C-alpha cells in the first residue's frame, strides 16, 4: 500500500514546519551551524557565532516556508502527484501589444548642444569602526577596524585614508571625496546606486544600518546642496545582508523599517509619487527633465543571494511588470529613459535577467542609458537583439566603488550626457573616473587629492560611447593585449593585481563584458 507515501511525507514536513517555529528549535539549528562554521574554518569563532545568530531567524523561516514546506518538499521527493516543487521556476512578464518601432540608433548631437553632467556614486561602504594602524590582513572577513587587532612588526597598519585590502572606508575619506568634487562639477544630478553599510556583516543591527543610511545621506546632501540625488537600493542596506523580503511579507520582519527610513531620508530629493513606490518595494520613477524618465530599480528582487526569493522568485514586487508599464508610457510620449540600479542585470537570477534582457531589447529606442555598480570594478555589459544575439543595442555602465574593498583605490564616476533640450537623445556621450591614490594619500601629513584617472573616449579612441563602441572595444581587446592591459589597469582603478592576467583571465573578463544576460553562454561564442 504505497498509497500512503504522500500522506506520510506531508505529515513529516507539516511536523517539520511546526517544530521549526519554536525558538529553542531555531537555536538548535544555529548551534550545529556554528560548530560546522568553526569546523570548516569559514571564519573566526567570534564571527561564526555572531553571523549565524544574526541570520538564523530569517533563514529558518524562509526554509520553513519554501524548501521544507510540505507541498514543495514532497513534490520534489515524490513528484507532481504529491506536491509541486517550483522553487526558482521560470517565469515571464508580459509585453504590451504595441508594435516595436524600427530600431534607431541615437542621433549625433548637434554642434554646441547642451550637455548634462551626472555625478555617479556607488558602493561607498562606510565603516563606522575603521581604525588606522590596525591589521589590514586580519582573520575576519573585514579588517582595518576595531577588533581587527595589530599587524606584525613587518607590515604597516591600515592607512589613514584606507587600505589596499579587505577593508572599507572611514567617514573622513567619504568626506574627502565629496569635498574634492569641485574640479569635476558642476553637476545637474547625482545617481547614487547603493551599498552604504560596510562588510561587517556578522553583526549589523537595524540601527547600525539606519545610522549608515542617515549619516552618509546627510553627508552628500551637505556637499551637493541643491543638486538632486537619485539613490538606488544596494544589497548591503538591509540586515541581514541581502535580506529583502518582497512586499508579500508583512509584519516587522519585512523591509518596512528600511524603506520608510529611506523615504524620510530622501524626501528632499524624491517627489511624492516616487516616495510612495519607494516605501513599497524600494524602487521609483521620476522625471529629471522634460522628455527624460529616470527609473531606480531595486535589484535585490533579482539577486541570487536574496534568500527570501526561495519562497517566490517570480517578478518580486511586480517590479519588472511595473518597469514595462513605465517604459511603454515613455515610448508613448516619446520620452527617453535612464535606468539606475545596484546589482548589474548580468549577475541576476536566470529568469529575472532573461526578462530584463527582453525588456531592454523591446525598448531599445526609448532606453537611453543604464547605470549599475555592485561589482566594485570598472566595466560594462553590452545588450544584443533577441533574434540573433549579434546587433548591439544597449550598454550598461558598471562604475567602480568608492570603497577600497577589496584591494583597490577609492573611486567615483562622472558622465557627460546628451543634455536638457527637446529632441535630445539623453544618451551617455563620454565618462570619467576619479580615484584617490592611497599610496600617495596615506603618506603621513599629506592632504588627499582626488585625481582624474581617465576619460573614456580619449583613452580608448572611441568616436562615441554608444553600444557599438563597447562591442567593438571588446573585440579590439581580444586581439590587442596592450589595449586589454590598459582596460585591466582601469578596471581595478589604477591598482591592478600583480598576478598577470593571461589568456584565460582575459577571455573570462571579455566574456563578462558581453554577458548582460545571466547563464547565456552563446553570448561569448565569438570569444571561445
Ligand atoms: C509567486 O508570485 C506570482 C506573482 O506574484 C504568482 O503568480 C500569480 O499567481 C496567481 C495564482 O495564484 C495568478 O492568478 C491567475 O491569473 C490568471 C490571469 O491573470 C492575468 O492577468 C493578471 C492580472 O492582470 C496578470 O497579472 C497576469 O499577467 C502575468 O501572469 C501570467 C501568469 O499568471 C504570465 O504568463 C504573464 O507572462 C504575465 O506576466 C495574467 O495575464 C487568472 O485566469 C486566474 O484565475 C488567476 O487569477 C496570477 O496571474 C499570477 N501572476 C503572475 C504575474 O504570474 C505565483 O502564483 C506565486 N507563487 C506561489 C507559489 O505563491
Ligand atoms: C599612485 O602613487 C604611486 C606613488 O608615487 C605611483 O607610483 C609611482 O609610479 C611612477 C610611475 O610609474 C614610478 O616612476 C614610481 O617609481 C612609482 N613609485 C612607487 C613607490 O611605486 C602610482 O603610479 C600612482 N598610481 C596612479 C594610478 O596614479
Ligand atoms: C484504493 C485506492 O486508493 N486505490 C488507488 C488506485 O485506484 C490508484 O490507481 C493508485 C495510484 O496511485 O493509488 C491507489
Ligand atoms: C512560465 C513560462 O511561461 N515559462 C516560459 C519558459 O518555459 C520558456 O522557456 C521561456 C522562453 O525563453 O519563456 C517563459
Ligand atoms: C531643462 O530645460 C527646461 C526647458 O528649457 C527648463 O524649463 C528646465 O528648468 C531645465 N532644467 C531642468 C532641471 O529641468
Ligand atoms: C560582489 N563582489 C563580491 C564582487 C563585490 C563586493 O560585494 P558587495 O559589497 O557589492 O555586496
Ligand atoms: Zn558593494
Ligand atoms: Zn553590492
Q: How far apart are CA 505 and CA 387, in angstroms?
A: 29
Which protein residues are within 6 Å of ligand 2, measured from CB?
A: 437, 439-440, 494
Q: Which technique was the structure solved with, according to the deposited record?
A: X-ray
Is residue 375 lining ligand 6, measured as CB closer than 6 Å? yes
Q: Which ligand has an atom closest to residue 410 CA?
A: 2
For 277, half-sphere exposure in the C-beta direction (CA atoms, 13 angstrom radius) is: 20
Interval between CA 183 and ligand 6 midpoint (Å): 29
C-alpha 98 – ligand 4 centre gap (Å): 21
Strand order in the sheet with 115-121: 229-231, 189-192, 115-121, 411-418, 428-436, 450-455
Cite the DSSP H helix spans in 97-205. 171-179
Atom of ligand 2 nearest to the CA of 453: 27
Q: What is the C-alpha R_g of the chain?
A: 24
Is the CB–ligand 4 distance for residue 94 below 6 Å?
Answer: no
Cβ atoms of residues 378 and 433 within 8 Å: yes
Q: Are 236 and 125 in contact (CB under 8 A)?
A: yes
Q: Measured in whole angstroms, how far is the alpha carbon of residue 132 from the centre of its chain?
A: 28
Closest CA to 71 of 2, 18, 12, 19: 12
d(CA 344, CA 512): 11
H or E stretch at 256? helix 256-265
What's the DSSP call for residue 267?
T
Sequence-separated (6 or more) residues with CB below 8 Å from residue 385: 103, 361, 391, 393
The grid coordinates of residue 421 equal: 533640450
Q: How far is the CA of 363 from the centre of ligand 7 (A)?
A: 29
* Contact criterion met (CB below 8 Å) for 514 and 382: yes
Does 376 show up as a binding residue in the annotation? yes
Cell numbers describing residue 481: 593585449
Which among 327, 364, 431, 507 is positioned nearest to 115, based on CA atoms?
431
DSSP state of 165: S
Residues with Cβ within 8 Å of residue 287, at least 6 apart in sequence = 293, 294, 335
Q: Answer whether 342 contacts ligand 6 (Cβ < 6 A).
A: no
91 Cβ below 6 A of ligand 4? yes
Strand pairing category for 292-296 and 336-340: parallel
Torsion of CA 274, 517, 55, 127, to 10 degrees: -70
What does the DSSP assignment read for 111-158? TT--EEEEEEE----B-TTB-TTS-TT-SSSS-SBTTS-PPPTTS---
CB atoms within 10 A of CB 503: 8
64 close to ligand 6 (CB < 6 Angstrom):
no
Query: Ligand 1, closest atom to CA 86?
Result: 60
Q: Which residues line ligand 1 (CB under 6 A)?
A: 86, 92-94, 312, 314-315
Ligand 5 centroid to Cα of residue 69, in Å, is: 54
Amino acid at each position: 500500500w504505497g498509497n500512503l507515501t504522500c500522506p506520510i511525507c506531508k505529515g513529516l514536513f507539516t511536523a517539520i514546519n511546526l517544530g521549526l517555529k519554536k525558538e529553542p528549535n531555531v537555536a538548535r539549528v544555529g548551534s550545529v551551524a556554528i560548530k560546522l562554521c568553526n569546523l570548516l574554518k569559514i571564519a573566526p569563532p567570534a564571527v561564526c557565532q555572531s553571523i549565524v545568530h544574526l541570520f538564523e531567524d530569517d533563514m529558518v523561516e524562509v526554509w520553513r516556508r519554501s524548501v521544507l514546506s510540505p507541498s514543495e518538499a514532497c513534490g520534489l521527493l515524490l513528484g507532481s502527484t504529491c506536491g509541486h516543487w517550483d522553487i526558482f521556476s521560470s517565469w515571464n512578464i508580459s509585453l504590451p501589444t504595441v508594435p516595436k518601432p524600427p530600431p534607431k540608433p541615437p542621433s549625433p548631437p548637434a554642434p554646441g548642444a547642451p550637455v548634462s553632467r551626472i555625478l555617479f556614486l556607488t558602493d561607498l561602504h562606510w565603516d563606522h569602526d575603521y581604525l588606522e594602524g590596525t591589521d589590514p590582513d586580519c582573520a575576519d572577513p573585514l579588517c582595518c577596524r576595531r577588533g581587527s587587532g595589530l599587524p606584525p612588526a613587518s607590515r604597516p597598519g591600515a592607512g589613514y585614508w584606507g587600505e589596499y585590502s579587505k577593508c572599507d572606508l572611514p567617514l573622513r575619506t567619504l568626506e574627502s571625496l565629496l569635498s574634492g568634487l569641485g574640479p569635476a562639477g558642476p553637476f545637474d544630478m547625482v545617481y547614487w546606486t547603493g551599498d552604504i553599510p560596510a562588510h561587517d556583516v556578522w553583526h549589523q543591527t537595524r540601527q547600525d544600518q539606519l545610522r549608515a543610511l542617515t549619516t552618509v545621506t546627510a553627508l552628500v546632501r551637505k556637499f551637493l546642496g541643491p543638486v538632486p540625488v537619485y539613490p538606488a537600493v544596494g544589497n548591503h542596506e538591509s540586515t541581514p545582508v541581502n535580506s529583502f523580503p518582497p512586499p508579500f511579507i508583512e509584519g516587522n520582519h519585512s523591509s518596512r523599517w528600511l524603506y520608510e527610513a529611506m523615504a524620510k531620508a530622501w524626501e528632499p530629493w524624491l517627489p511624492a509619487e516616487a516616495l510612495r513606490t519607494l516605501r513599497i518595494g524600494g524602487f521609483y520613477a521620476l522625471s529629471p527633465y522634460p522628455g527624460l524618465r529616470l527609473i531606480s530599480l531595486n535589484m535585490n528582487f533579482c539577486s541570487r543571494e536574496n534568500f527570501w526569493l526561495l519562497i517566490n522568485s517570480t517578478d518580486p514586487a511586480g517590479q519588472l511588470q511595473w518597469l514595462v508599464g513605465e517604459l511603454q508610457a515613455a515610448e508613448d510620449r516619446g520620452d527617453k529613459v535612464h535606468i539606475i540600479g545596484h546589482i548589474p542585470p548580468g549577475h541576476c537570477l536566470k529568469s529575472w535577467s532573461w526578462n530584463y534582457y527582453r525588456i531592454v531589447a523591446r525598448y531599445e529606442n526609448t532606453l537611453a542609458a543604464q547605470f549599475f555598480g555592485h561589482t566594485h570594478v570598472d566595466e560594462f555589459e553590452v545588450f544584443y537583439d533577441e533574434e540573433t544575439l549579434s546587433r548591439p543595442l544597449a550598454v550598461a555602465f558598471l562604475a567602480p566603488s568608492a570603497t577600497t574593498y577589496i584591494g583597490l583605490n577609492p573611486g567615483y564616476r562622472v558622465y557627460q550626457i546628451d543634455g536638457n533640450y527637446s529632441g535630445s537623445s539623453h544618451v551617455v556621450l563620454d565618462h570619467e573616473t576619479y580615484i584617490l591614490n592611497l599610496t600617495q594619500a596615506n603618506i603621513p601629513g599629506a592632504i588627499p587629492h582626488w585625481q582624474l584617472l581617465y576619460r573614456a573616449r580619449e583613452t580608448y579612441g572611441l568616436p562615441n560611447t554608444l553600444p557599438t563602441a563597447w562591442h567593438n572595444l571588446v573585440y579590439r581587446m581580444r586581439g590587442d593585449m596592450q589595449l586589454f592591459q590598459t582596460f585591466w589597469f582601469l578596471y581595478h582603478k589604477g591598482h591592478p593585481p600583480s598576478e598577470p592576467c593571461g589568456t584565460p583571465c582575459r577571455l573570462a573578463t571579455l566574456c563578462a563584458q558581453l554577458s548582460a544576460r545571466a547563464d547565456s553562454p552563446a553570448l561569448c561564442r565569438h570569444l571561445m
